[model samples]
Target chain A: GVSYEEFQVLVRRVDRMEHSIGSIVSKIDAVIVKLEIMERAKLKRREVLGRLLDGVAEDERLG
Target chain B: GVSYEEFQVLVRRVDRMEHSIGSIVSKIDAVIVKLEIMERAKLKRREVLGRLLDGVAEDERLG
Candidate 1:
């Protein structure tokens, strides 16, 4: 018993969802690459920080 | 003269962008967890595969 007027909106909503999912999938693909690159960069930074800290005396690295 | 029909469509397009970006942000948050889990799982699987390969070598002790 759905009216054609409201039915158009319903169809449009589903279309919107389909578009949303595809865009989200693409976003996920792009985001994961950035996240992975950041994770590796952070790991490298941490290792460098550790060496820097090790180079510091008992007075403390932050000091 | 521009009809409200075309103008409404234009307005809805911007609305869609707002929703699309909000959706992408939420999606990025969810996707990162799954990606991190899969990344760690792959790392764990690699170690497991390494152990399996070591076992398949049939032992230096067998020599």
Candidate 2:
């Protein structure tokens, strides 16, 4: 129901919205990658801590 | 630059895109919340591990 010029404006606005949304999505993806890295590090620390506790437990049990 | 019917179609598509993108953003936010919880747990574990190690160190140093 809109004029040609009005339609052109809407098209431009829609394109801009798409571009902005795409940027946000990419940023979110980057954050997810970082979180995954942190998660891996967390697991590693947990494994190391568990090993340390096991050593402590052995010292206490044997002595 | 499009007909009125074509403009309507474009409008609908843009609206759908917005809705879909919003949903994805919300899901990412939820993931971020979960990551934050994990991060807090990790910090707590690190503190507890540090305390335990300090006790072990003190025992070795004093005895």
Candidate 3:
């Protein structure tokens, strides 16, 4: 058994860690949001870029 | 005919994006590495801390 003070230290550390995990989770979400945004923006831009090539002949040399 | 320049512009842009995905994957691997390091360090420390706090009530009370 631990002293009341020592027990409180463990409990307090849990509180600290719970908050820290949320912070860590939030950071991961931060990357996800940016990746989604980049995909959205790039997908739209690529469609336009691809549209510019839409009239290509079947024998078109993309090479 | 789509101008050669427009087609090449698209390829260069795509080539650029190809390298960009690799960079993103590398960034994610780094995040994983950092998280593993943090968890490993904390778990080791917690084991030591827990040992220091473990004992029978009588044993702890004697201290």
Candidate 4:
């Protein structure tokens, strides 16, 4: 049992949550790239840490 | 102009979004820790990248 006003508030709340999550995800992606680049720039160890992150970022959304 | 059924469905949808964001945030935390650990283990460079990540993870939730 919800009124139109309540529904609108919920919609706006969810939209803000979605936008915040998108920003956080982008920040995480940037940090990950920075980490990988650091490792590569310094030295390619026998066990590359970047390989461990291969499957971690399989799903991402940006548009 | 929302009905009770529509409101219920939206509630469920928002809950799932919240849960998924929590999981993603947890994974991001884990990866950040791994990166820091790797850097500390290998070598403490004059310019540590972990320092760069200092402000990046300033605001994180865990409980």
Candidate 5:
């Protein structure tokens, strides 16, 4: 048989676990966002390089 | 003075700050998730290498 006080302690323990899980989930989302941003930056750099190469090719043709 | 109106204003201020902190905590949690994933991946790779080395050694003894 469980007392009211014991039940309250169990509730508190569960609440603490919920908080910890919530915090972990939040951080994981942030890292995923950061990884996505890094991927976008890489793609942008590639696009810039492509334009630069195209310009160089056009210059050679003109010369 | 235990004024009802002043109590409301204080509560509002506390609520606003609580919301702001919650947003910050969410971002921090997302970052933690990313780190956790990275750490797990690293440990897995290490485990794979250890297993492969053990297999190689066993094979050499058999031959």
Candidate 6:
């Protein structure tokens, strides 16, 4: 096997490969958390905006 | 150059490292989109929350 291929083989045999994979998975988890937080926050904003617009319309009619 | 006798280097140098790795590139792009969406939603929430809090504070003196 060529040196690069051999290095890959060595990596597969060692624990470093697993460690790297674990780190990648951890990063993915963090990304997912941020995505969910964003979706929830967006929904909350939409609700609040709707209420503000409705309240303004009602006050205008009363004045 | 001192070569690792057990392994060989495939490419002496790599450019566009991120795109060269397919799986990693996919994961990175996905994470980036999530981060962007989260940031947008958070900003919207801050705006809405500020308005709600201000309205409440203003109306408190009237009651």
Candidate topping DockQ: 2
Candidate order, TM-score descending: 2, 4, 6, 3, 5, 1
Positional deviation of residue A61's Cα in model 5 after best superposition, in angstroms? 4.4
Model 2 Cα lDDT, one tens digit per residue, B1-63: 366688678979888887969887797889879978978987998899899889989988996
> Mind sharing the TM-score for model 4?
0.58
State the C-alpha lDDT per candidate. 0.73, 0.84, 0.65, 0.75, 0.71, 0.66
Least well predicted 10-residue stretch by lDDT in candidate 5 chain A: A1-10
Error of 5 at B3 (Å): 48
Off by over 4 Å in 6: A1-13, B1-22, B33-63
Error of 4 at A30 (Å): 1.0
lDDT for A33 in candidate 1 is 84
Q: Residue-wise lDDT of candidate 3 within A1-63, one digit each (tens)?
A: 435565456556655655665576567669867766876997799788767766453335453
> Which CAPRI quality tier does the interface of model 3 achieve?
incorrect
Measured against the native two-chain assembly using Cα atoms, what DockQ does each of the candidate structures obtain, in the order listed?
A: 0.08, 0.38, 0.01, 0.35, 0.06, 0.13
In model 4, the Cα lDDT at residue B17 comes to 84
Give per-residue CA lDDT, model 5, range B1-63, as digits (tens): 345465556556655655666777777767677767887997799799979988976996795
Q: Sort by lDDT, best first.
A: 2, 4, 1, 5, 6, 3
lDDT of 6: 0.66
User: Which CAPRI tier for candidate 5?
Assistant: incorrect
Highest lDDT among the candidates is held by which one? 2
Worst 10 residues of 4 chain A by lDDT: A54-63
Q: Local error of candidate 1 at A1, Å?
A: 41
Candidate 6, pairs of clashing residues: A3-B7, A3-B8, A4-B8
Instruction: Give per-residue CA lDDT, model 2, range A1-63, as digits (tens).
Output: 557887778788888988888888888878888878987997899799989988988998896
- lDDT by residue (B1-63, candidate 4, tens digit) is 657897888788898988888888888889888978987876775347667555445643231
What TM-score would every model get versus the actual structure? Answer: 0.37, 0.70, 0.46, 0.58, 0.45, 0.49
Lowest summed lDDT window (length 10), candidate 1 chain B: B1-10
Which segments of model 2 are wrong by more than 4 Å? A45-63
On the 0 to 100 scale, the lDDT of residue B2 in model 5 is 40
